[PDB]
RNA sequence: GAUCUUCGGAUCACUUUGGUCAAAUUGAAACGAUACAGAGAAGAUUAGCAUGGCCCCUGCACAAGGAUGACACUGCGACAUUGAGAGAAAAC
């Protein structure tokens, strides 16, 4: 019964280069190509973050809209906009 | 708000939002490598041009190439049975 709070203060930026020798970015298909397929499942960092309703759920600007949808960033647990 | 008008009002303008889709692991493709075999025509080496399409790739191309691009190239029963004999069975 209290307004929702932002989980992460910062913004997850993108800067990472797999397999430094054998990978090269692809402008059209926005990901790194070349190098060993490496794996189908191996790649799977662990969510650094995690959310729970108890300490995180609350009011937000979208409650007014009847057909509004849930935050893609809340469920994985880094929605940084809070109630806004 | 500007313009007149006479303190009644009139003019002037009048409804956006190009959306492969919300800050990139789990809805834009296609694969590296390692291990196996491993280069068309009836001996051996070898030119090629074709046929077929839910196989494509390079190409501006209705040129031409990719191993002659690759794969494929077969096969069966609208057979009517009687021709006859033998033991059984049922029958001349
Ligand atoms: K040849
Ligand atoms: Mg050819
Ligand atoms: Mg051919």
From Swiss-Prot:
Segments forming C3H1-type zinc fingers: 65-84
Compartments in which it is found: Nucleus
Stretches assigned to coiled coil: none
Superkingdom of source: Eukaryota
Ranges for region Disordered: 1-17
The protein's role, per its UniProt record: Involved in the first step of pre-mRNA splicing. Required for cell growth and cell cycle control. Plays a role in the levels of the U1, U4, U5 and U6 snRNAs and the maintenance of the U4/U6 snRNA complex. May provide the link between the 'nineteen complex' NTC spliceosome protein complex and the spliceosome through the U6 snRNA. Associates predominantly with U6 snRNAs in assembled active spliceosomes. Binds directly to the internal stem-loop (ISL) domain of the U6 snRNA and to the pre-mRNA intron near the 5' splice site during the activation and catalytic phases of the spliceosome cycle.
Annotated family: Belongs to the RRM CWC2 family.
Quaternary structure, from the entry: Belongs to the 40S cdc5-associated complex (or cwf complex), a spliceosome sub-complex reminiscent of a late-stage spliceosome composed of the U2, U5 and U6 snRNAs and at least brr2, cdc5, cwf2/prp3, cwf3/syf1, cwf4/syf3, cwf5/ecm2, spp42/cwf6, cwf7/spf27, cwf8, cwf9, cwf10, cwf11, cwf12, prp45/cwf13, cwf14, cwf15, cwf16, cwf17, cwf18, cwf19, cwf20, cwf21, cwf22, cwf23, cwf24, cwf25, cwf26, cyp7/cwf27, cwf28, cwf29/ist3, lea1, msl1, prp5/cwf1, prp10, prp12/sap130, prp17, prp22, sap61, sap62, sap114, sap145, slu7, smb1, smd1, smd3, smf1, smg1 and syf2.
Domain remarks in the Swiss-Prot or TrEMBL record: The C-terminal RRM domain and the zinc finger motif are necessary for RNA-binding.
Name recorded for this polypeptide: Pre-mRNA-splicing factor cwf2
Organism: Schizosaccharomyces pombe (strain 972 / ATCC 24843)
Top-level taxonomy: Eukaryota, Fungi, Dikarya, Ascomycota, Taphrinomycotina
Span covered, complete protein: 47 to 130 of 388
């Amino acid at each position: 019964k209290q307004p929702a709070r932002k989980q992460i203060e910062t913004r997850p930026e993108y800067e990472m280069e797999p397999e430094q020798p054998g990978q090269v970015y692809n402008l059209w298909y926005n990901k790194w190509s070349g190098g060993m397929r490496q794996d189908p499942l191996k790649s799977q960092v662990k969510s650094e973050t995690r959310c729970v309703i108890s300490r995180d759920s609350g009011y937000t600007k979208a409650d007014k809209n009847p057909g509004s949808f849930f935050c893609l960033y809340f469920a994985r647990g880094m929605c940084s906009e809070g109630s806004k």
